[PDB]
Symmetry: C5
Subunit: 257 residues, 5 copies
Amino acid sequence: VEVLEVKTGVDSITEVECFLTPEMGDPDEHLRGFSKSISISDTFESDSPNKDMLPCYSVARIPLPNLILMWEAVTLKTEVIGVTTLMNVHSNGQATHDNGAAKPVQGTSFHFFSVGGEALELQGVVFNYRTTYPDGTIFPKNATVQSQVMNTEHKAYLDKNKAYPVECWVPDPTRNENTRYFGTLTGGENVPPVLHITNTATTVLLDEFGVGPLCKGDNLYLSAVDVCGMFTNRSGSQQWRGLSRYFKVQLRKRRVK
Amino acid sequence: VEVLEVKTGVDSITEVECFLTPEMGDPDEHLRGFSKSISISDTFESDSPNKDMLPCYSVARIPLPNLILMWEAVTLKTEVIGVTTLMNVHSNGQATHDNGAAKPVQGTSFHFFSVGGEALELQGVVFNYRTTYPDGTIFPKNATVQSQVMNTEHKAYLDKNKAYPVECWVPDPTRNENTRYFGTLTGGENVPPVLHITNTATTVLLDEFGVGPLCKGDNLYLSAVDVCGMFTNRSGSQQWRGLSRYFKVQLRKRRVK
Amino acid sequence: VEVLEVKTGVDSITEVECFLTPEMGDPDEHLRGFSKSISISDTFESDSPNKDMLPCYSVARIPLPNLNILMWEAVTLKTEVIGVTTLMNVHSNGQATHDNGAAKPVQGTSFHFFSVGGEALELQGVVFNYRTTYPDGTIFPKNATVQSQVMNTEHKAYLDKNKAYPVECWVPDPTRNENTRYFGTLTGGENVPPVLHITNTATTVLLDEFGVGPLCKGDNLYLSAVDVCGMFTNRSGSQQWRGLSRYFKVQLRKRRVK
Amino acid sequence: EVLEVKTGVDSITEVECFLTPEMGDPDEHLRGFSKSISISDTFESDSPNKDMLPCYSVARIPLPNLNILMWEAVTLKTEVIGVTTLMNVHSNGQATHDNGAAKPVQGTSFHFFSVGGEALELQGVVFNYRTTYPDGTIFPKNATVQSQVMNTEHKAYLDKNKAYPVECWVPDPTRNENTRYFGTLTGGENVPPVLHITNTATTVLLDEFGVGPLCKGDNLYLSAVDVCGMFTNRSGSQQWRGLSRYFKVQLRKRRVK
Amino acid sequence: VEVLEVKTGVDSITEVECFLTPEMGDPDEHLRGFSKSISISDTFESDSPNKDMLPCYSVARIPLPNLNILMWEAVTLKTEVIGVTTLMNVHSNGQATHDNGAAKPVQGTSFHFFSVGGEALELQGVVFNYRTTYPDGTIFPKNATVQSQVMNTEHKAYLDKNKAYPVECWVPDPTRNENTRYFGTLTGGENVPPVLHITNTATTVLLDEFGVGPLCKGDNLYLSAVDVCGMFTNRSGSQQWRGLSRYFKVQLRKRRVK
Ligand SMILES: CC(=O)N[C@H]1[C@H]([C@H](O)[C@H](O)CO)O[C@@](O[C@H](CO)[C@@H](O)[C@@H]2O[C@@](O)(C(=O)O)C[C@H](O)[C@H]2NC(C)=O)(C(=O)O)C[C@@H]1O
Ligand SMILES: CC(=O)N[C@H]1[C@H]([C@H](O)[C@H](O)CO)O[C@@](O[C@H](CO)[C@@H](O)[C@@H]2O[C@@](O)(C(=O)O)C[C@H](O)[C@H]2NC(C)=O)(C(=O)O)C[C@@H]1O
Ligand SMILES: CC(=O)N[C@H]1[C@H]([C@H](O)[C@H](O)CO)O[C@@](O[C@H](CO)[C@@H](O)[C@@H]2O[C@@](O)(C(=O)O)C[C@H](O)[C@H]2NC(C)=O)(C(=O)O)C[C@@H]1O
Ligand SMILES: [K+]
Ligand SMILES: [K+]
Ligand SMILES: [K+]
Ligand SMILES: [K+]
Ligand SMILES: [K+]
Ligand SMILES: [K+]
Ligand SMILES: [K+]
Ligand SMILES: [K+]
Ligand SMILES: [K+]
Ligand SMILES: [K+]
């Protein structure tokens, strides 16, 4: 399709505002936003994580006003919601030293968001190809030792919530022409969360040709991961803790051939 | 309201200058700027922090010269006051190693400020929905497991000083059109404070259309949190320590219809 | 080479898109992307690392559409480390950070490097310890002397073979490489956290200060990479380097030369 | 009223000097160091020895006599002098581990400098209002518990060298209109010094109206603090270590009414 | 000197390209690039470091094409630390970070410094401890007093000899050096990770605020450096400074002066 001119007039712009909840595993009715405590396999070959222990990608498909014109996503404001919850250092955590406050949430984090006019395209890569991923997840199939670095058979769409585990999928850099994505992995058991909030920062979604994601079938795709670190229980057991992400996207009508 | 032209001339600008004190809990008559020492609950479900153990958001409502014209906030200079107090490593503390100086204030910090033409709008998010917040604080009511990630029932206004606990409220990104807010949470038990001071830095408060916060009823709302970290006593017990925040805001008269 | 005008027209541009797999040592059939566990010699004179223990530079020579004097000129690069989220696997027979805790994540010394050129990357040999014996099957600084620990100009090579040039004994030669653009960061320390950014919105321009990108001799583009992310610690305490693949997308245009 | 700048080869001058640190100087061999740091048992009993307290440095520099013209400070180059001294890890130190080199200078730092046309204006803030500041220092008088966050009674001028302790005074952000100040407090017991040197970096001292500090009575005021960290002796006792600061200021003649 | 116009034409420009080796002490014939292991004095007054334990400033005086009034003006610099990947040798008589682990990498206090000038770098002496006795064969602050621990204006010198001026007791004199451009960073702490970037795409402009670079008196260019990367800990726990070489490429042009 050739991309032609932008429509103007009051009717030619719309905005989407929503939040995506994290999908950390939710091991019971009290533990939304947390994973199951992490257990370590006894051998490398026997790695077999339970579903409730695996954070997954979040995705939302947002219907847009029914419209060839297509909605074009132009700008994004985004923010992690509830950053201050990490100041709760009194809820049966593990004291940092005798008589001290509880160790706060810290350690490995992944903060990721994307906006596209279609599902985020994923490529599978595994730390350990002999990992058995659990029933109820969607994972790289027929994994081989090459899957530990790059196996081009592992292609997928982020088209279901609570399904695609964070650890075995990444955005496919060979695709995603119609999505804009951004992510940071910060590894290490002691890394401090650094979480900024403001309502004054905007990301522009236009490519080098001045064209944003074009929304196929009048749907906008939002995806996110916000694993903030791990919470350490009094006992020493550790659980991933996630937070929700706010999205505000401005869109305009674009004519295409 | 339609936003029209800025008024000019001698009478057309004013400035507000003030400071907001921190509200860290103030557990006795000698401990202004500190919280009660932190105790950890025996079970996750039994989390029940004392009011004096909970830092709260600070807020001041500043009356402006009586004026349709509205005062429009254009610029901000702001600074944390008393940064050098953290060099007192010679009292009541715990030696870092044998014969050493006292461990300084360090660990989790939250530094936050906002300027608006009405009260800061808040969204409640809790680390643990079964936490019992104490009498005398304003907290998310009817919390459910969903409140651990996002429950849209928890809406409030920062309309009372020394009342809204930092750990269960954040600025609501879905509102606050008439406020500009900025915050950073830095977690981890050993993170060092890094506090910059200068009288040469200005933040511009105008939005993408050149319009700043417009002060309803001729009132300016300033809000802050500056939890710098925790002080460690000889025994190992820890108390939050906060500092005051300076604000200087320049405003101009704006006609609206 | 007198560089003259760029060609225009639909036929005058092309793109290369590919990935380079990491070459960390691959000690057995199950450990692609990992090195052999690291052992330490008791003296400098007895340093004799096995090949499987040594990360090597990755390189690919990519044939371009045949020309002919026109040369393909590399103008822009998008690049990304592939599989960053694998580092969230803290459940696979690692070493618990404390009693009942999750496994220690991959961390420690990293080297992230990539280059795009119109010919093989030119290397200079430098060694931590001149008495290290590099193993059969690797290409290494020959006739090393104690001066090789700081600079010995005899140690010149081309990155012309995959999984052969060990990362620790070669660097890009700053005295050469006029027809390549290279970028690298070494972050040392046993506890340093990986910080890995991904996005499809970032482009690096490959043009020099005169507006000229690498010119592809014999219609070949050379891509090189190292992405040692840190070390994985096993339950036993033994440590292995872990690497990831790197994606490259390069835009090229036809340039006339004299 | 600020009017035009004078031109001509005679319309400019410069000041070049250095300010020595004032760390306490506990004996004839320990210039640049404080006395070893001890820890009082309680806030109430806190009574630091004069030789244990770093103080602000200040110099009042007479300028060429003018009279209405004033000297206007336009640019600053500044540098910490002697950064490589911190590579002496072989002198009376505490080995980091068996057979190791000495632990280097590290921990809490405060780096601060200012250039003004009159004395730096100070605001008193104290970590602990019951601290008894020693004879020979100038400190907040009639401190109350409110002095721990903000007590507007504690106003002073930095008008004497070796006298104003760093820990109980900061620049007063409510004043200092005729000064430019810059500082960073980096806390934590183990934080590493990061000290940059170059002769290629210039700070412009002009405000948003294009006006620099105007030198009242033809005096320029320079102030500094450069507490680099603490030096740990073999026994583990710790002392503040400071370094001198270079200033080069360019000034021009400005007419005023 | 009044500075007048730049000369143009093919003959009006020249380049200097070289490397400066680190001078860390070189305690024996196998340890070029390292210092002697660091020992600690038991008092301030007894501090008496041996020469081979003291890193020194590196300097090269580079003769330029003879001109005579014209002077060579240094305009741009490209510079790089050479051999950054040697720090990935964590298998050579180091100290395991934990049982069965790899060796602790080079880390801790670093100083990275370079300068380009039209005359010798001007130095100011400052000492950690004025009672330190600096060794025979070094050039050090003479007649040191307690004031030498903060600032003693007697301690003025020129960086005019290689392997001679210890890093720890000398810095560039900010009160002079008008005809030099210098840049340095000291990163302290015993555990700080080295962070070393390499690229052939970065240039530093040496022109001052008037558009004038360093002017080469007597047609000599002065290059100086220090690259103490950190300390290497051997198996016994003893620690030695480790340094690396620095590459310089400087472009110069002819400038008329009066
Ligand atoms: C935030 C929170 O709810 N923390 C609690 C955790 C948490 O619910 C689970 O770890 C989620 O996976 O549970 C803690 O107690 C558990 C459960 O009862 C432990 O005592 C473990 O119980 C076992 O029965 C089990 O889970 O199978 C046996 C196991 O050996 C126990 N683990 C340990 C380390 O003792 C917890 O500490 O993990 C309580 C915590 O407040
Ligand atoms: C700066 C300061 O005032 N430090 C003192 C603190 C401080 O006043 C409180 O922690 C503020 O909440 O108190 C220290 O003593 C306390 C009581 O004064 C402890 O002994 C605790 O007393 C209890 O009664 C209590 O609940 O507060 C019982 C508790 O078991 C005690 N805790 C400990 C760790 O012993 C203190 O160390 O916290 C003295 C300190 O100088
Ligand atoms: C990711 C992975 O495969 N980890 C396993 C490693 C790994 O395969 C090798 O270290 C790669 O070089 O092996 C672990 O077990 C090995 C045997 O496979 C050890 O028991 C070591 O075996 C030796 O035979 C050997 O030289 O490799 C002898 C050596 O003494 C043993 N080392 C130790 C520290 O016990 C491993 O822990 O290294 C298992 C791990 O899951
Ligand atoms: K398995
Ligand atoms: K593509
Ligand atoms: K409760
Ligand atoms: K809104
Ligand atoms: K050998
Ligand atoms: K060259
Ligand atoms: K007292
Ligand atoms: K004021
Ligand atoms: K001596
Ligand atoms: K000078």
